[PDB]
């Protein structure tokens, strides 16, 4: 009939887009959280009644963006720091009074360019290689090395990703929402929750739990080359400690250039390790093995094994505790076979100092030694399994973006398009 | 009731059309460090996308309007739906999909219908 189009400005309609997000937070930490905008104390979460949105955590660009943001903030926090290239010199190393940590003396440059000094420093095994025995730092034949500034903290601080004006983020309130599909209950937020950028391996630490039941996510779970992202609902507590009482020793290697060396151990020489409750880890593996049958069979047997190969970062529960990078053997956590129907586990963890962090080959970092006795307490709230191509699941990881994907599944970035044309029996005058 | 930003996303086109200022407020404010350049790029992007919608409203004679009535008659090729089966049945989300193809055409019709309207008004006042 008499129908003319009419313009409407401000219509609840949006499109899937990807924009540049910005950070918000609440010593300087590597994640420059001091440069982020203050998190608003009144977080507005608007619930979208009747709305049903399609999500796909495996295409999410927030993950790919967060992963390069961390890498970008890591590289930013190492520019002003001292370069340990004069440390790439021949070392004379002896064992310490098995044979893991060494005691290495070298000729080093002083603050005067024509004077040397015969200093000594302790180094873990994993940081040196042979040629008194003659050794050398591991990185020297591959990459330059930069000492982490000893005033920046590796502490995961809750970061919130915010979308610009005219964009929004769509949460997913579905308590049993797996990876993809149409989220029945949806709400819109301006920023994400407090995401801690915990760099970890095999065991997802300090993350966000699952309500109701323990979830399991994967692209193609029938595809063996896709890591299974299992998320716990009850946290199993893990306690880690390096018990040696280490000491830090400054070594002036140039004008304004001080290399912090491991002085000596004050007292007992002991192993670093982690404890988990064997009971709580038994019942948590059971909750996992239950939801593992929903995809593989009520009668097939589910077996857990340790890693089958790779580099130290992926074959071990790699993480950071009070500033020192642990590498824990996990064979004591994934050694169970499950049929159709005080306690403590202890993990031998090694310690390293020359760490390449991500997978960059060219940018190594020396973590300065932490004085005192290191111990930290954290929850393992997730897991990264890998079924063997009896269905056996073994831990694994490496690609750090699965860590970010384990917390960014709930979210999606959409672009608001508020112009809408629709017909009514309306017309303007002359 | 006050549903909130995009609160009426699942409501009918008629219901949501009464809550336009809700979505109109938060389109410009919201509901050399790494973050420094990351934020500046977003502050410029928000202004550009805002002025583009304002630019279209301006050349349609709708500047300042939230509900704007025009002169372009509704071509049934775009959607042969009845009035009562749109404003009381569909959601703006569904509507934007069904008019996806014809949206660029309407945007041109609304433009010349305004340059001819003011060219006519320049003659109405030439006496």
């Amino acid at each position, epitope marked *: 009939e008499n129908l003319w189009v009419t313009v409407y400005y401000g219509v609840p309609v949006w499109k899937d887009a990807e924009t540049t997000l910005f950070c918000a937070s609440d010593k300087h930490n590597v994640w420059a959280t001091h440069a982020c905008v203050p998190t608003d104390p009144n977080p507005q979460e608007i619930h979208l009644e*009747n709305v*049903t949105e*399609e999500f796909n955590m495996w295409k999410n660009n927030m993950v790919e963006q967060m992963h390069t943001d961390i890498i970008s903030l890591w590289d930013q926090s190492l520019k002003p720091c001292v370069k340990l290239t004069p440390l790439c010199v021949t070392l004379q190393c002896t064992n310490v009074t098995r044979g893991e940590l060494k005691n290495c003396s070298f000729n080093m440059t002083t603050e005067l360019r024509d004077k040397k000094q015969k200093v000594y420093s302790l180094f873990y095994r994993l940081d040196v290689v042979q040629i008194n025995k003659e050794y050398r730092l591991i990185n020297c034949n591959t990459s330059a090395i930069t000492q982490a500034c000893p005033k920046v903290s590796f502490e995961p601080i809750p970061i919130h990703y915010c979308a610009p004006a005219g964009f929004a983020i769509l949460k997913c309130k579905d308590k049993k929402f797996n990876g993809t599909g*149409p989220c029945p209950s949806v709400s819109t937020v301006q920023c994400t929750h407090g995401i801690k950028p915990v760099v970890s391996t095999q065991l997802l630490l300090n993350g966000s739990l699952a309500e109701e039941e323990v979830m399991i996510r994967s692209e193609n779970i029938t595809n063996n080359a896709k890591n299974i992202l299992v998320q716990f609902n009850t946290p199993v507590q893990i306690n880690c400690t390096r018990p040696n009482n280490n000491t830090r020793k400054s070594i002036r290697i140039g004008p304004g250039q001080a290399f912090y060396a491991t002085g000596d151990i004050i007292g007992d020489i002991r192993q670093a390790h982690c404890n988990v409750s064997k009971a709580t880890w038994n019942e948590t593996l059971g909750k996992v093995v239950k939801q593992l049958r929903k995809h593989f069979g009520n009668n097939t047997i589910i077996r857990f094994a340790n890693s089958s190969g790779g580099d130290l970062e992926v074959t071990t529960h790699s993480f950071n505790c009070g500033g020192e990078f642990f590498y824990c053997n996990t064979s004591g956590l994934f050694n169970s076979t499950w049929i159709s129907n005080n306690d403590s586990i202890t993990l031998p963890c090694r310690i390293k100092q020359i760490i390449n962090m991500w997978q960059r080959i060219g940018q190594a970092m020396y973590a300065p030694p932490i004085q005192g006795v290191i111990r930290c307490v954290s929850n393992i709230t997730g897991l990264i399994l890998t079924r063997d191509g009896t269905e056996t699941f073994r831990p694994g990881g490496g690609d750090m973006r699965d860590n970010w994907r384990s917390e960014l599944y709930k979210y999606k970035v959409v672009k608001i398009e508020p112009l809408g044309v629709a017909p009514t029996r309306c017309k303007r005058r002359v | 009731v006050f549903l909130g930003f995009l609160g009426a996303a699942g409501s009918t086109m008629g219901a949501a059309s009464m809550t336009l200022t809700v979505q109109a407020r938060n389109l410009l404010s919201g509901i050399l460090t790494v973050w420094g350049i990351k934020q500046l790029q977003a502050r410029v992007l928000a202004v550009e996308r805002y002025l583009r919608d304002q630019q279209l409203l301006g050349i349609w004679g709708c500047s300042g309007k939230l509900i704007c009535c025009t002169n372009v008659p509704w071509n049934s090729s775009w959607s042969n739906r009845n009035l009562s089966e749109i404003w*009381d*049945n569909m959601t703006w*989300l569904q509507w934007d999909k069904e008019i996806s193809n014809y949206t660029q055409i309407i945007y041109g019709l609304l433009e010349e219908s305004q340059n001819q309207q003011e060219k006519n008004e320049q003659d109405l006042l030439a006496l």
Partner: nanobody
Amino acid sequence: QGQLVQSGATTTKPGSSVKISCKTSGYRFNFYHINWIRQTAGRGPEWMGWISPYSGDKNLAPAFQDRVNMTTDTEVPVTSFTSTGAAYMEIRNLTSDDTGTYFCAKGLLRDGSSTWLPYLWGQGTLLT
């Protein structure tokens, strides 16, 4: 704009109860009421009642208030604007007067004055 398939022709005897299904598709189930209407031998057509899958609300004629069990499940979302639902119907004091063809009908609009009007119907079920 979808289908509303129903159960089969389950013929019982007076005194018992009969449960007839109505499985929906091709449309958002929670956005429209589900009307129940019957056309028996002895009268013409008679409107029994509708139920709102979203609000859970139920409104039925006084001629069937103390007989009809009207319940709905919760939709399993297929796409953004598609789901699959299910509507149930029972009758208490069944007799031979209640023998006829029974249907479910999707409501007409989401607002206005004809919200619940039986617009999109099923196929029918033959009772006793």
